[PDB]
Structure 1
Amino acid sequence: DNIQGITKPAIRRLARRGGVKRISGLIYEETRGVLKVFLENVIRDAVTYTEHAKRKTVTAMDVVYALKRQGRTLYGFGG
């Protein structure tokens, strides 16, 4: 599956940038669930803005407005 494309080594890299020294084996599946929940929440709102505009293309701005609503404001992609 695609969620499994988010690899153990890549999750490690993320942890490292997070200052993490040692990782438990259950961490990788736990991290995947968290990311999926995060993407579902943000993508759901962005697509809601896409449909409202009557488009078939999810725009950077759709994503930016979605992130802002979730209180996760992002700089660098417009607006």
Structure 2
Amino acid sequence: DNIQGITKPAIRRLARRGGVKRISGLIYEETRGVLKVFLENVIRDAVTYTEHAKRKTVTAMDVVYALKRQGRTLYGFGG
């Protein structure tokens, strides 16, 4: 599938910025699953603000507002 687009070397790069030194082999599929749950929760809310405004295009603001109610405020695209 597409989730495999998020590759081991990229997952490994994230881990490194997180200060991780050694990584187990099963971490990669574990990460993908968490990333997917994260995006689903946020995108769901973003899409809900999109539909509410009657648009067909998801806006930065829709994402920003969604991240905010998930308690994950993001600065830089407005917030």
Following superposition, the deviation at residue 78 of structure 1 comes to: 1.7
| C-alpha RMSD of matched pairs (Å) | 0.6
Q: State the distance in 2 between where 1:19 and 1:54 align.
A: 43
Where does the alignment leave 5 or more consecutive residues of structure 1 unmatched? Answer: none
Matches within 5 A, 1:1-79: 1-79=1-79
Cα deviation digits, residues 33-57 of structure 1 (max 9, x gap): 0000000000000000000000000
Cα deviation digits, residues 5-44 of structure 1 (max 9, x gap): 0000000000000000000000000000000000000000
Q: State the distance in 1 between where 2:14 and 2:72 align.
A: 18
State the percentage of identical aligned residues. Answer: 100
Q: State the distance in 2 between where 1:73 and 1:2 align.
A: 27
Q: TM-score, normalised by structure 2?
A: 0.98
Moved >4 Å (runs of 4+) = none
Kindly tell me the number of residue pairs found equivalent between the two proteins. Answer: 79
Where does the alignment leave 5 or more consecutive residues of structure 2 unmatched? Answer: none
Q: State the distance in 1 between where 2:7 and 2:77 align.
A: 26
